[model samples]
Target chain A: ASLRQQVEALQGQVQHLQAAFSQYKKVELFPNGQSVGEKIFKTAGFVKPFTEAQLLCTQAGGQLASPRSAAENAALQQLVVAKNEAAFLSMTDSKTEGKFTYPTGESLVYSNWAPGEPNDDGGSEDCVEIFTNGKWNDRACGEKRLVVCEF
Target chain B: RQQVEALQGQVQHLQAAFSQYKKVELFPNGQSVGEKIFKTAGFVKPFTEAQLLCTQAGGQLASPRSAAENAALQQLVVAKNEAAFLSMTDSKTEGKFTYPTGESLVYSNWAPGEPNDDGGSEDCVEIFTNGKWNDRACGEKRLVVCEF
Candidate 1:
């Protein structure tokens, strides 16, 4: 076969293979750090304050949780419920109070705020946390909460 | 020489992407019932594609080994309210079925008059939401469920 034909063959076969972006990662599953074989959410039910949560997630090759869609919210929320506690999210308003952004400074496109939340109560609230019900609340950064990381 | 090298790079990238894509398609997350684990491709495809996806996921297209296993796989299909392709086929020797593994089918749940190859091209097989099997065209798209 000609080189052109070979290229086309590889292109066709690769393009035909499917990808599953819908089902993110298995919730609360982190068999280990090196097994990066397609994952989205991982939470060993480890609880820490916001900064500590970020450090542990980084060590595990992921960031603290940020659910981009309702399905992802559901996937991650299930983990939170199993732990039966609120969990820290990756994005925070720490840099610009009342304006939540990812650690790298990108604004959150989606958020599930419980009614009357993000009140950043008493100017101490900067980090974000997700409840078992999948609602978001702006909480103080130093408070310990369940640590959930997103891969 | 330049053209060949460029094409080679493209081929390698595609190969890597394809490998990752299929792995993602056939993830390890599966529901278990009675020791057998069944993972859904979570998408639909024709028979051969389903077979390949499962094999890449390090498993096989789900072929229930017994009644309980059948129910285990059926629960996934029933939950989705859809029919899914199975691994057994009579494509090689009509009316004499075997799984892709070449193991003879000992446990089965064929619907009445099945293995019929009804339309002359129905050598492929699938399990209905109700847990009955039917011979179907391998070209038809259906849910891809894998077994481990």
Candidate 2:
């Protein structure tokens, strides 16, 4: 009789754990991903100023996409090229007109600028944008453009 | 009955496996807090850049409105051994601190001798590990906490 009672108790414990495991598996931490793996990437279809775009992406639980690696850059280009739009990245020279860095204050170690691009166009292009062809250009922060967000 | 024990044994094995998966698991209450806020010692940036980082992360610089919230923020920063930028700023009036949302200050945990408006140039606020606040120049770099 005692053995039977112990077995019943064990069964309940197992059932509870099973339910918890299943629930945990169903949790979606990043739901807006165009592709989800170690990182997440998404593109905003609408255009907004650089600052506004940053705010919008943050409100969506991400920062402007900063491609630090070749794979990440390729991934972002893949997303933007499909939509045929230029998207604002998190890179900016707001702190110092000529020196650009990511929002996190990390200097750009890898970049993909097009020929004669980032000439600080008109001396007003302080923010960076990635074009559809996977090259970068500098633009005024107030100019409206599509955005890419990453997590 | 034997089958039940076998299933229970399997459950224990599964639990051990799951435990080995590295994660930044929050406590029950901590989970709620984490969902509403973000804290990282990853990098430090000036006030403007920090604010932009928070905004891009879908949150504003953290504005602790009550004692409980402030205490919770203190705990997070203390655990990470880092200071954090707050949303409080006196930029509008130079002496009157306000949140980024334009809300009037209802609660403040200023450190002793704080908000002295030192040199008449200190305009931004940051929270120290002791759960108290300090006013500093807006150009200073520090870790940041963001609130959704």
Candidate 3:
């Protein structure tokens, strides 16, 4: 076959493989009862300090969840909105005060902050949490709160 | 041949479409990959400074969480023919390499006997053109890949 034809053939095969593999990447409930998308999201009712919660997620083979887009945020909301409990997000300003960032170093591009929230209340609120209403609020990192892990 | 020119035109059109949307490319699964604002500094900087450059671009140091993502990064490095700093580091707790995003070091392409903690001071990670990772001093200068 001509080189161009060979390249075209390979591209066709890649498309097929992608179609087959895409199904496995779709959102699904894992054996652990967590939803998996590009990453896995699981909620833990146990409250712990922000740092501890971060470590817990790491220990579980994931990281603290940080929604990077509106779609991802909504998906996360669906998981915890019904629980009516706030969970720690992987957003923090600990590294650069007032500049919140994901644990993975991604900038905060999409946020659903509640009105007037993240006021850095008392000048000590450096951690972020997702409220039951699907909005974010800044809280003191030392405060114990429910946690969410994302793999 | 005309067939080859036609294929080239199609490829160009596809690239134009992606650029119109300000995207870098589409994933095999049809997910569009957006382009970040950062470019290679063409010079080396310490890990912390390199991270700042990424932040300045409204992103962070490169953190490839999956094999596919890592492969994508490797391609870029291979094209540049140089090594680049990644966000992986064991500074938080010795030998426990982790991404700034707090993700565990589950996927690694470490070079042979790498992360050896040579002299117990090598804590940061860098990826060479071959896609294998190596531990380096955090203060050493190296190229960086910023991600949005």
Candidate 4:
């Protein structure tokens, strides 16, 4: 076979493998089961593509479970997918005075640590924050910052 | 005629699958294999920072099997500290041994918090097996896992 044909044949084999592999399901959880995408956003303070999102999730102990069956996909939609604050508040534990802390057992991982940020001021100011305007800022744990929570 | 159409449909499906596969596989410069390997190796995260550093430094946890690999590791450890040695048994004298890399967690099997090393003064490393983590110092000796 010509080089082109050889390449084409190998390509065909790969497609079969891809389709077969996509059928499996996996799940990953970070320190306290926090969403990796949200972690990456807090860490890098930038929205990343889906693969980048998956990388962040993996770093935090999560995997991309996808190609859902019709039923599974429909079931997934029930998961509230609010684009902003409303979503974060829903996942947040209300009892904790801080945005998310020990009692809630959740704090932003992959911290961006802006120049001298996260002063970790020993008191109410011991957490990280991500502004809604796409800028990542640190704040006192007691202070509230926009969040995007997920189940 | 019907059989021929079925064959054609199968051929079309197969063709599309092949096209999709090649596009993804080659576009990334044979990266999928490396990416998968990188992810699998990432399982090393829970290991001590010293071990991780050593592994990255072309030295795995000192295997010290033949007198050579063992001697090499011993020299490496001693170069870092005076009391370092490789043995299956503890040095018999506590506080005599330390790792090539400054103390991280090692030899962690405590008897129901027996050696609580309270305040985490137990700054040693442990190997986990059979459902438990046992403290084993760098020189005092124990089984080790290594890579070339």
For each candidate, the alpha-carbon lDDT, in order, equals: 0.75, 0.75, 0.71, 0.33
DockQ of 2: 0.06
Q: Write the per-residue lDDT of candidate 2 for residues A30-149, one digit (tens) a residue.
A: 112344357778766678899899998799888998888778888788767655678899999989877889998978989999898779877689998898888999989998878778
RMSD of 1: 12.8
Residue by residue across A10-77, what tens digits does model 1's lDDT show? 56754543222212222112221111324467675568998899999899888888777777787777
Candidate order by decreasing lDDT: 1, 2, 3, 4
lDDT of 4 by residue, B7-95 (tens): 54676686687558645533321112211200011112223533553343233443233433433433333333322212222223344
DockQ of each: 0.07, 0.06, 0.01, 0.01
- Write down the DockQ of candidate 3: 0.01
Per-residue lDDT over A1-151 for candidate 4, one digit per residue giving the tens place of the 0 to 100 score: 2555545665675576565444211111111122223221222223343334445545655333221133322222222121232111211223454443322256533232346654445544433344333223344434433322233
Order of candidates by TM-score, top first? 2, 1, 3, 4
Alpha carbon deviation, residue B125, candidate 3 (Å): 60
lDDT of 1 by residue, B9-63 (tens): 8767866875576455335445555544577755788998788766644567888
**Model 2 ranges off by over 4 Å:** A1-39, A42-113, A116-151, B1-31
What is the per-residue lDDT of model 2 for residues B1-148, given as tens digits with 9 covering 90 to 100?
A: 5676677678788777755531433331121243354345245678997887656444567788888788888887787677888888999997789988787899999999998988877999989999899998988888766655
Docking class of 3: incorrect
Q: Count the backbone clashes (under 3 Å) in each candidate.
A: 0, 4, 3, 24
Tens digits of per-residue lDDT, candidate 3, B1-148, equal: 5665566566557556534533322211122123222235445678998887666434577776666666777776776677889988988888889888776887888899998989878999998888888999998888766665
Candidate 3 TM-score, C-alpha based: 0.40
